[PDB]
Design a protein around this ligand. Structure first.
Ligand SMILES: CN1C(=N)N[C@](c2ccccc2)(c2cccc(NC(=O)c3ccco3)c2)C1=O
Length: 390
């Protein structure tokens, strides 16, 4: 129903991440923590770093327990390494509970912490299968559910401003909500539609059809989920498999052909600017992703606007122009529904019923002519064939 204590508990933006305040140790040490549905470790800065103004000090926590085990995590865009342990953890604008959770105390990292992001760690909300070093390291949410009466469900409303927020504004602005243990009806409009969680590792889903301004991309649906499709608040962009990316960009270019943009724009590298207030939203198409429904041979669609897939960025000249980066990019690891897609919707991670819910977000950016949408049902056949198998 209503979870006023957790509403508006997030800050941040799509490019730098959305974070929630947490406390670790006794006495409590306050830290800002990235909400990451694409990983499964609770990992916090525990040693000085040039981009950290605070970190977890294990020697100051009376409830700190050393697990005597290291963790080394090299990833595509960087690396983090640290020491495993446990401590008492709370979410000040969350359920009124304290849990004993695993913590990876980050002692060394490369390109992990973002200068100016305002977060000092990450909260991996996905399942134990992808926890590092292995699945025996119980993720935070699993500990929270096992130790308390908190229902096995969380929901996220990520709120993009629709324009750039400077250093001061991003610290003072409400970035959205993470409702732990429930669904808050004030965060969305219309109905919630659910897609099954295909498998519990990442939050894996199945896309069955893709349209650009109602025109079917017409690919074998297995291509859309090659090698998987996930919902990931820990990624900025909508990331698409190489072949799907190439087809989608061709169609988005064709729909917006009244204006030509340089190659660097479509590569997500360079910004495009328009005179203040003149962004031609109407020339860019809407993108509909059809997801497998909970009923046999039924699907539903989520429709996003260019106000979601064009990410607002401030100009190099700090001008009065309205500038953006194209927030759709290619992937070699499947589809990733990142922060820019999540900004259009209230997303319900219903772990108890192995399903993900989508509803139009009460804070999605739109114009007077178009809105994001969550609609259904549609008759869709052979949807299990859309799932990829190695
Ligand atoms: C894709 N992805 C993710 N889902 N989480 C990782 C991660 C986490 C643990 C271990 C390996 C990789 C990450 C690591 C560091 C930062 C961010 N996220 C951001 O900086 C960010 C910005 C906007 C949204 O998220 C995400 C990552 O690679």
């Amino acid at each position: 129903g209503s979870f006023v204590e957790m509403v508006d508990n997030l800050r941040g933006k799509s490019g730098q991440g959305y974070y929630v305040e947490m406390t670790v140790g006794s006495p409590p040490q306050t830290l800002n923590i990235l909400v990451d549905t694409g990983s499964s470790n609770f990992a916090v800065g525990a040693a000085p770093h040039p981009f950290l103004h605070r970190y977890y000090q294990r020697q100051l926590s009376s409830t700190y327990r050393d697990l005597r085990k290291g963790v080394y995590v090299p990833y595509t865009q960087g690396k983090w390494e640290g020491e495993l342990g446990t401590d008492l953890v709370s979410i000040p604008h969350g359920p009124n509970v304290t849990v004993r959770a695993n913590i990876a105390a980050i002692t060394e990292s490369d390109k992990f912490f973002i200068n100016g992001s305002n977060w000092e760690g990450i909260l991996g909300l996905a399942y134990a299968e992808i926890a590092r070093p292995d699945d025996s390291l119980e993720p935070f949410f699993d500990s929270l559910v096992k130790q308390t009466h908190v229902p096995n469900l969380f929901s996220l409303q990520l709120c993009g401003a629709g324009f750039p927020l400077n250093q001061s504004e991003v610290l003072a602005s409400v970035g959205g909500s993470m409702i732990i243990g429930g669904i808050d009806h004030s965060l969305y409009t219309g109905s919630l539609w659910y897609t099954p969680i295909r498998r519990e590792w990442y939050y894996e889903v199945i896309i069955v059809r893709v349209e650009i301004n109602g025109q079917d991309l017409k690919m074998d649906c297995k291509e859309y989920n090659y090698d998987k499709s996930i919902v990931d608040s820990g990624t900025t962009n909508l990331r698409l498999p190489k072949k799907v990316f190439e087809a989608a960009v061709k169609s988005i270019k064709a729909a917006s052909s009244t204006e030509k943009f340089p190659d660097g724009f479509w590569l997500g590298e360079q910004l495009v600017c328009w005179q203040a207030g003149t962004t031609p939203w109407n020339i860019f198409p809407v993108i509909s992703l059809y997801l497998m429904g909970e009923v046999t041979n039924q699907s539903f669609r989520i429709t996003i606007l260019p106000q979601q897939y064009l990410r607002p960025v401030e100009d190099v000249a700090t001008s009065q122009d309205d500038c953006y980066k194209f927030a759709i990019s290619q992937s070699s690891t499947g589809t990733v529904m990142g922060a820019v897609i999540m900004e259009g919707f209230y997303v319900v991670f219903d772990r108890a019923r192995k399903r993900i819910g989508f509803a139009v977000s009460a804070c999605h950016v739109h114009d007077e002519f178009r809105t994001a949408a969550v609609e259904g049902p549609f008759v869709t056949l052979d949807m299990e064939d859309c799932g990829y198998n190695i």
